[PDB]
Design a protein around this ligand. Structure first.
Ligand SMILES: CCCCCCCCCCCCCCCCCC(=O)OC[C@H](COP(=O)([O-])OCC(O)COP(=O)([O-])OC[C@@H](COC(=O)CCCCCCCCCCCCCCCCC)OC(=O)CCCCCCCCCCCCCCCCC)OC(=O)CCCCCCCCCCCCCCCCC
Ligand SMILES: CCCCCCCCCCCCCCCCCC(=O)OC[C@H](COP(=O)(O)OCCN)OC(=O)CCCCCCCCCCCCCCCCC
Ligand SMILES: CCCCCCCCCCCCCCCCCC(=O)OC[C@H](COP(=O)(O)OCCN)OC(=O)CCCCCCCCCCCCCCCCC
Ligand SMILES: CCCCCCCCCCCCCCCCCC(=O)OC[C@H](COP(=O)(O)OCCN)OC(=O)CCCCCCCCCCCCCCCCC
Ligand SMILES: CCCCCCCCCCCCCCCCCC(=O)OC[C@H](COP(=O)(O)OCCN)OC(=O)CCCCCCCCCCCCCCCCC
Ligand SMILES: CCCCCCCCCCCC(=O)OC[C@H](COP(=O)(O)OCC[N+](C)(C)C)OC(=O)CCCCCCCCCCC
Ligand SMILES: CCCCCCCCCCCC(=O)OC[C@H](COP(=O)(O)OCC[N+](C)(C)C)OC(=O)CCCCCCCCCCC
Ligand SMILES: CCCCCCCCCCCC(=O)OC[C@H](COP(=O)(O)OCC[N+](C)(C)C)OC(=O)CCCCCCCCCCC
Ligand SMILES: CCCCCCCCCCCC(=O)OC[C@H](COP(=O)(O)OCC[N+](C)(C)C)OC(=O)CCCCCCCCCCC
Ligand SMILES: CCCCCCCCCCCC(=O)OC[C@H](COP(=O)(O)OCC[N+](C)(C)C)OC(=O)CCCCCCCCCCC
Ligand SMILES: CCCCCCCCCCCC(=O)OC[C@H](COP(=O)(O)OCC[N+](C)(C)C)OC(=O)CCCCCCCCCCC
Lengths: 80, 183, 105, 95, 353, 78, 161, 149, 55
């Protein structure tokens, strides 16, 4: 069911919904890293997992700021 | 550290349900070509109470067993069976002596540990009576390596950290030795 | 050389020794090719995944099925509930079948 | 995206349909059809038609234009020149 | 019977312990509402509730029961999701946070080396419950409260989290029970008096209590996010807010006043020497004393929660944002550097024992 | 210049006074933060005048004696 | 009875029918919660709490952005879907849930043998901090460098002046 | 003038903490002590005439991996995770009552069932491409083929 | 430059909330004072002969 690109329907029809999809996709990689590190008893993989969480948080902030300013520009006359 | 593993019991049955854990038993004994040994029957509290007495009595056998492990080059579990049995018998002998010479003092100590979260700092009164009795009957002395003799924490007169709740049996026994032994 | 396969307590884990022997073989000057180190690489990958050993277990289970052997006659006894690791199962002399306490240690 | 997609023929065709929903004198309406004479519209009837035409094309006649418009063709010319699509949200365009 | 009953109780014993634990927290929360009205009354030279039950002891029961017998207002009966999703998330967040609160040594439902993280993480979930009420709502006063609620979270969350981390850094442990035992010789109020004030300020901001009561300002937003709530949704939100007040008051007693540790070690020994340790009566008294020590310290800050309400006016939320970022954050970040420098200088880096 | 803004490289003491009076949230936050590294630089003074560092903890596994095995060891035999 | 399957099925059903932006951020919360709970049991309790500590704060900031952008578009836009086709789509996706095709790796269980050589036992977080601040201190410093860039980046994008 | 009526709610709140502390400190301690007496209910409940005064075991906190190993070892010796015994020699049953947990190593359900999280270039290759599995099956096949020699 | 109090003195009051604790102390004083409440209907407020009520 994945090869027919079923996930393209589960994503909503708003720009912020695309942002949510990216966070979920990146979160799946981090969960996989924790899964492998825990089985191996490897703290190096848990270091990688922590880095992925911190880096993904930075990505969300930058993307939101661009989207905030993009919404600001349209409602920017502010004559009142 | 309460990290879940595949080597011991996990935190809750929900972890077992997610892992589909099977607690597997084996009904086969060691093969007859390996000489049989008597396993140590002491639980957690007696072992922690006698930890420094086993080390003092069986230091050469502890080192020899551990030196066998390092020199086995990965084949430690199989090659060092002979050295392992020496440690088990020597450790059992220490516990046997504690049950024949210092049973009252030994039982007072590890029952205090069970009463005080198995913390050494909370059973100094019971440990001091036990340490004195073992030395006078077994010539074994607790020693903490790597530090000067007078700077051992178990010999400290006024420790900063002290037990919140006193152990009544330890308090009574300690007073019975203060007035009588030290007239 | 950076540390890899570090256990949850700061030391080497179960499979670091296999990884260390692979590195020593690959970086040893006496070897002309990496062929002698091929067997060491398989052991390290076997340490993590146990794919070959699981395959061996698959054959034994499948082989016993065609012979009609019952799994409970040649397998190992197991308990699925931790509260039912009773003293009767553990073989204690006065062992009872009452459930053990696993709520609060 | 944000651009007019109107044509002179389509605007005229929909202008005639709106004006035929009233009690006009003649159903034959073209560019040169006058509101006052050919259609027989008074002050209030003409303003009813102008607002009705505003609703169809989503445009707003200004005061000067509405107070001086005479023929249907002038209405058609105003719609072509001034009509714009309403701005959509951010999600409609870029998604 | 008899034999089949004397093991049935053992089978269900730990459920009674949890039910008793739940009742213990609820009683404090229920009578905190009565205590707050009584405390403010005398400070305002009124009396407070004294005519609902003997001397007002049934005031909490009447308020809860009357609201539980009230109509639930919603656009449709099927809309029970909308007005209940918010309060339930808020209530579950604060109730689960109580699992790691030890009333004595090891007397906590959840014991873990990451209890500090679980405490902060569980509390952050409660913020999501408040913002749920403003779910494209048609009520303008509900919407304005959600904007203020998010603004307050940005203020205290960074400050509150870092202060708890300094205490954890001083003990080198994220276990609450280890933090309590580490204060045997010194209570952390003395070395970290500025942090205790900062923690209490953040606790007031977290619970939306005055002078930081911008979410539920009656003179600004009638009732805030609860203006459209009635009957059970109001009770659950009301219960959750006061459960946080007790929890934050108990946390202040734990982090800076030694938790359950006795006020005087000599008095603790004398009282327990009157009881035999071979009987269960010793451990019944011991639990009363250790929790009594926690209760006295916790009741003082629950008194202080009421005390500041009756003595200070409300501060604007935009002023609160500047207060935390310009003042509180630089101070706490300065201390998080100062403390390791002191410990390393005197060879006193902390370890867990 | 009864209330002018001091120039830092010309009147360093007066420049610090301005921020201590007008920006207390900045002057004293840095002052507390500075004492951290300052005490770290005073560590050698404590090492020579007050007491020495503790012996490192045996957090490196079992202490293996640095010697060959004693082949003349018996007792507790089978 | 793996109840994680039922929760994900409910979450997947609402993903296909979510219309407005508020329902999308609710999907995100309904995604992190199963991740945290499934991490809290089984594999790693430490990162289950770390996920709660970090992502819940991001959710609130995400939510407050939605209040400044909603523009009535999805309150009246129609959707067609169909109950029968939605269930059929979810049913077919339910048929295949084998992420890997190594049957031996998925069907044969393994155990580990614990050892007493680690007398110094500490939490995984302490070991992570030990390596992160000593072995991989460059990664930690670069991460702070990235955090510095984000702080400057947010200001220049958003601030009018 | 101390208003005693204002202090009544605080006294009840004080009793609220004591209710939790009194029940938890005593019931949990009694349960641990009762289960440490022996492996059968006739010893846990019935107190012998020659038995000495009861010594209580308080709840354990701040544990590590070593304490998990100890708890299982104590279970195999006394039938309780905190059983008490200072015997020099264990029973013969202790030799063969070892417990080894066997469990699966599959990925979390959310990773393989979420409508969005399970989709990636590598996950599709693992799920739908036989390139990895065909090559790894060679190693499994080499094991059996190398027996006869 | 013309402040009477030193920067350290002004910072000590500002950081330690000097006037806030002063306000708290005054409020606590009333907690130990007699309240004004009367127990209606068991007690009645003052009345005068000029009072206007029911006709
Ligand atoms: C304790 C020491 C007090 C004491 O023993 O006697 C006072 C107190 C009774 O007050 P009182 O003797 O009637 O007051 C004297 C005159 O009546 C009335 O004399 P007064 O009201 O004119 O006394 C005035 C005195 C205040 O009166 C006091 O002296 C009380 C002390 C208050 C400060 C300490 C608290 O001074 C003040 O007003 C300033 C105090 C507040 C300043 C700010 C707080 C500083 C701390 O005696 C008691 O301790 C018994 C009451 C305690 C409560 C018991 C029941 C509690 C409810 C249990 C559940 C049911
Ligand atoms: C609530 C639904 C829980 C359903 C369930 O499966 O719970 C199983 C629960 C576990 O058994 P447990 O009580 O923990 O045994 C301890 C023995 N020392 O054992 C149970 O069956 C719990 C059933 C009783 C709990 C209901 C509340 C009891 C207290 C009422 C006051
Ligand atoms: C530049 C000056 C750095 C030198 C210094 O301040 O002291 C370094 C000090 C080594 O000196 P010493 O204490 O005698 O070594 C112990 C030998 N047993 O080593 C130390 O004592 C540690 C000094 C820690 C402070 C250095 C970093 C401060 C700034 C942090 C950024
Ligand atoms: C936690 C206990 C208290 C909360 C219980 C509330 C239960 C409601 C469903 C919870 C979410 C389950 C997974 C669904 C994903 C979110 C989808 C959603 O938007 O909420 C469902 C709710 C149902 O109403 P409905 O009219 O059918 O949907 C709109 C149709 N156009 O449509 C709505 O928009 C109403 C939303 C109300 C606020 C809900 C906010 C999210 C709650 C998440 C907390 C639980 C975490 C997820 C647990 C289940 C995971 C699958
Ligand atoms: C919880 C952990 C504990 C947290 C709390 C820690 C408490 C310790 C706080 C340490 C920092 C306190 C610094 C106080 C000394 C510096 C302040 C000072 O002396 O004044 C600044 C001074 C300017 O002089 P001025 O104040 O204007 O005096 C004339 C006014 N009539 O400026 C100067 O002349 C010298 C510049 C300052 C040098 C010292 C810094
Ligand atoms: C328990 C301690 C508190 C008891 C207070 C009390 O029983 O309160 C008295 C009640 C309530 O009547 P009220 O008008 O609020 O009484 C307050 C008097 N005032 C106004 C002067 C302050 O009256 C009754 O006995 C009638 C009901 C029968 C007893 C039911 C008890 C309540 C059930 C829950 C608690 C068991
Ligand atoms: C601000 C005052 C804090 C305070 O009064 O608390 C500090 C002290 C006590 O605590 P401590 O001396 O810091 O340590 C704990 C010392 N014991 C062992 C005596 C508990 O309280 C009182 O003696 C009152
Ligand atoms: C001894 C210790 C005391 C040293 C005091 C030095 C103050 C220098 C100063 O304030 O520098 C002055 C500048 C610029 O000030 P301005 O407002 O732009 O202009 C000045 C006023 N005018 C308009 C009249 C000219 O401020 C800054 O860079 C602001 C950042 C300071 C640090 C903020 C974060 C604090 C974190 C603390 C650690 C956790
Ligand atoms: C000590 C003490 O007072 O413990 C006696 C207790 C509680 O007394 P309390 O004054 O309600 O404790 C509240 C403490 N405050 C006044 C600081 C808020 O009394 C009982 O009901 C038992
Ligand atoms: C010990 C821990 C508990 C108390 C902690 C807080 C105390 C105040 C800290 C700042 C003081 C300061 O800045 O002092 C300065 C100020 C004001 O004096 P001034 O304007 O300089 O006077 C002018 C010059 N004279 C001194 C020559 C006249 O004093 C105060 O307003 C003191 C407040 C006392 C009442 C409240 C005390 C009890 C608080 C409630 C119980 C918790
Ligand atoms: C190094 C030692 C660290 C000390 C740690 C504690 C610091 C506390 C904050 C000090 C700064 C401050 O309160 O600031 C006041 C701020 C901002 O004021 P501003 O806009 O800058 O104007 C003032 C500056 N002037 C004069 C130069 C223009 O707003 C407030 O009124 C916040 C009021 C919070 C009250 C909460 C009290 C709750 C009860 C607590 C007692 C139980």
């Amino acid at each position: 069911m994945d090869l027919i690109l079923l996930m393209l329907v589960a994503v909503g029809l708003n720009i912020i919904d695309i942002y949510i999809m990216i966070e979920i996709l990146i979160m799946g990689c981090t969960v996989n890293t924790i899964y492998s590190a825990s089985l191996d008893n490897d703290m190096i993989g848990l270091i990688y997992s922590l880095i992925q969480i911190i880096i993904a948080g930075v990505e969300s902030a930058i993307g939101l700021s661009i989207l905030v300013n993009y919404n600001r520009i349209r409602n920017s006359e502010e004559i009142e | 550290s309460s990290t879940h593993t595949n080597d011991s019991l996990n935190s809750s049955n929900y972890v077992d349900k997610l892992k589909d854990t099977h607690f597997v038993f084996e009904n086969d004994k060691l093969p007859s070509e390996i000489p049989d040994v008597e396993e140590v029957g002491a639980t957690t509290a007696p072992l922690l109470s006698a930890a420094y007495f086993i080390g003092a009595k069986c230091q050469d056998y502890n080192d020899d067993f551990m030196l066998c492990q390092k020199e086995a080059k990965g084949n430690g579990p199989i090659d060092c069976l002979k050295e392992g049995r020496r440690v088990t018998r020597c450790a059992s002998g220490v516990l046997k002596d504690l049950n024949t010479h210092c049973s009252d003092e030994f039982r007072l100590h590890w029952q205090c540990l069970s009463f005080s979260n198995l913390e050494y700092k909370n059973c100094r009164k019971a440990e001091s009576l036990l340490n004195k009795c073992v030395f006078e009957k077994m010539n074994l002395v607790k020693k903490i390596p790597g530090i000067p003799e007078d700077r051992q924490i178990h010999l400290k007169q006024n420790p900063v950290l002290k037990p919140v709740a006193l152990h009544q049996d330890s308090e009574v026994a300690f007073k019975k030795a203060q007035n009588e032994n030290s007239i | 050389a950076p540390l890899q396969q570090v256990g949850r307590h700061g030391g080497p884990n179960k499979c670091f020794g296999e990884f260390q022997r692979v590195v020593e073989c690959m970086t040893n000057a006496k070897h002309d090719s990496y062929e002698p180190c091929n067997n060491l690489k398989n052991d390290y990958l076997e340490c993590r995944k146990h794919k070959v050993e699981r395959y061996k277990a698959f054959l034994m289970q499948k082989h016993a099925e065609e012979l009609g052997k019952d799994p409970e006659e040649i397998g190992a006894p197991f308990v699925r509930k931790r509260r039912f690791l009773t003293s009767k199962t553990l073989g204690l002399v006065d062992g009872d079948d009452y459930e053990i306490g696993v709520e609060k240690i | 995206q944000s651009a007019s997609t109107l044509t002179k023929e389509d605007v005229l065709t929909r202008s005639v349909s709106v004006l035929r929903g009233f009690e006009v004198k003649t159903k034959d309406i073209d560019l040169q059809t006058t509101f006052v004479q050919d259609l027989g519209m008074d002050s209030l009837d003409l303003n009813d038609a102008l607002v009705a035409l505003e609703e169809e094309f989503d445009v707003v006649f200004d005061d000067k234009t509405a107070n001086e418009i005479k023929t249907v063709g002038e209405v058609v010319d105003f719609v072509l020149a001034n009509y714009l699509p309403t701005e959509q949200s951010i999600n409609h365009t870029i998604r | 019977m008899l034999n089949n009953l004397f093991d049935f109780i053992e089978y269900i014993e730990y459920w009674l312990i949890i039910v008793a634990f739940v009742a213990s927290v609820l009683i404090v929360v229920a009578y905190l509402t009565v205590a707050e009205r009584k405390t403010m009354g005398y400070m305002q030279r009124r009396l407070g509730p004294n005519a609902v039950g003997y001397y007002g002891v049934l005031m909490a029961v009447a308020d809860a029961l009357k609201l539980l017998s009230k109509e639930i207002v919603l656009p449709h009966n099927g809309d029970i999701i909308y007005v209940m999703s918010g309060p339930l998330i808020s209530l579950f967040s604060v109730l689960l946070s109580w699992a790691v609160i030890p009333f004595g040594p090891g007397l906590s439902l959840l014991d873990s080396e990451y209890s500090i993280i679980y405490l902060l993480a569980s509390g952050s979930i409660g913020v999501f419950g408040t913002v749920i009420v403003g779910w494209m709502s048609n009520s303008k006063y509900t919407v304005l409260a959600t904007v203020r609620t998010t603004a307050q979270l940005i203020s205290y969350e960074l400050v509150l989290t870092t202060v708890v981390f300094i205490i954890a850094l001083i003990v080198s442990s994220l276990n609450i029970n280890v933090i309590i035992e580490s204060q045997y010789n010194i209570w952390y109020i003395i070395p970290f008096f500025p942090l205790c004030l900062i923690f209490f300020i953040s606790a007031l901001a977290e619970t939306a209590r005055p002078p930081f009561d911008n979410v539920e300002a009656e003179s600004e937003l009638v009732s805030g996010h609860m203006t459209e709530l009635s009957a059970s949704p109001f009770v659950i939100f009301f219960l959750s807010e006061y459960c946080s007040m007790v929890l934050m008051s108990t946390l202040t007693a734990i982090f800076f006043f030694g938790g359950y540790l006795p006020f005087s070690n000599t008095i603790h020994h004398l009282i327990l020497n009157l009881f035999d340790q071979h009987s269960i009566y010793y451990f019944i008294i011991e639990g009363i004393l250790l929790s009594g020590y926690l209760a006295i310290k916790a009741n003082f800050f629950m008194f202080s929660f009421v005390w500041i309400r009756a003595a200070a006016p409300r501060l604007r939320y935009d002023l609160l944002i500047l207060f935390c970022w310009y003042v509180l954050l630089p101070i706490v970040f300065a201390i998080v550097v100062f403390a390791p420098g002191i410990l390393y200088c005197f060879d006193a880096l902390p370890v867990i024992i | 210049a009864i209330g002018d803004y001091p120039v830092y490289y010309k009147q360093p003491i007066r420049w610090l006074s301005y921020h201590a009076h007008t920006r207390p949230h900045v002057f004293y936050a840095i002052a507390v933060a500075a004492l951290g590294p300052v005490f770290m630089m005073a560590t050698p003074l404590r090492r020579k005048f007050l007491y020495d560092d503790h012996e490192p903890l045996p957090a490196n596994g079992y202490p293996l004696p640095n010697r060959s095995r004693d082949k003349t060891l018996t007792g507790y035999d089978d | 009875m793996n109840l994680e399957i039922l929760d994900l099925s409910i979450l997947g059903f609402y993903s296909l029918i979510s219309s407005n932006s508020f329902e999308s951020i609710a999907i995100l919360v309904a995604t992190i919660m199963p991740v945290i709970t499934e991490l809290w049991y089984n594999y790693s309790q430490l990162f289950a709490l770390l996920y709660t500590l970090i992502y819940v704060g991001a959710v609130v900031i995400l939510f407050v952005f939605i209040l400044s952008v909603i523009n009535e578009k999805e309150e009246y836009e129609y959707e067609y879907s169909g109950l029968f086709i939605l269930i059929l789509v979810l049913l077919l996706d339910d048929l295949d849930d084998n992420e890997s095709n190594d049957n031996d790796y998925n069907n044969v269980y393994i155990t580990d043998y614990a050892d007493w050589f680690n007398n110094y036992n500490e939490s995984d977080l302490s070991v992570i901090g030990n390596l992160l601040f000593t072995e991989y201190a460059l990664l930690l410093l670069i991460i702070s460098f990235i955090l510095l860039m984000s702080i400057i980046g947010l200001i220049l994008i958003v601030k009018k002046d | 003038m101390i208003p005693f009526e204002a202090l009544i709610p605080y006294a009840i709140m004080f009793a609220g903490f004591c209710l939790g502390g009194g029940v938890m400190n005593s019931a949990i301690t009694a349960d641990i002590t009762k289960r440490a007496r022996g492996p059968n209910q006739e010893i846990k409940r019935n107190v012998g005439e020659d038995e000495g005064p009861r010594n209580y075991t308080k709840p354990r906190y701040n544990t590590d991996q070593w304490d998990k190993y100890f708890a299982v070892r104590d279970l195999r010796l006394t039938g309780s995770l905190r059983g008490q015994s200072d015997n020099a020699v264990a029973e013969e049953s202790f030799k063969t009552n070892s417990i080894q947990p066997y469990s699966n190593t599959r990925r979390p359900w959310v990773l393989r069932r979420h409508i969005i999280m399970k989709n990636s270039p590598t996950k599709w290759a693992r799920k739908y491409s036989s390139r990895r599995d065909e090559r790894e099956q060679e190693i499994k096949d080499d094991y059996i083929r190398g027996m006869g020699e | 430059e013309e402040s009477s109090e030193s920067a350290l003195s002004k910072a000590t009051k500002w950081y330690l909330l000097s006037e806030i604790f002063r306000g708290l102390y005054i409020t606590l004083e009333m907690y130990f004072r007699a309240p004004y409440t009367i127990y209606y209907p068991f007690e009645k407020g003052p009345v005068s002969p000029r009072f206007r009520g029911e006709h």
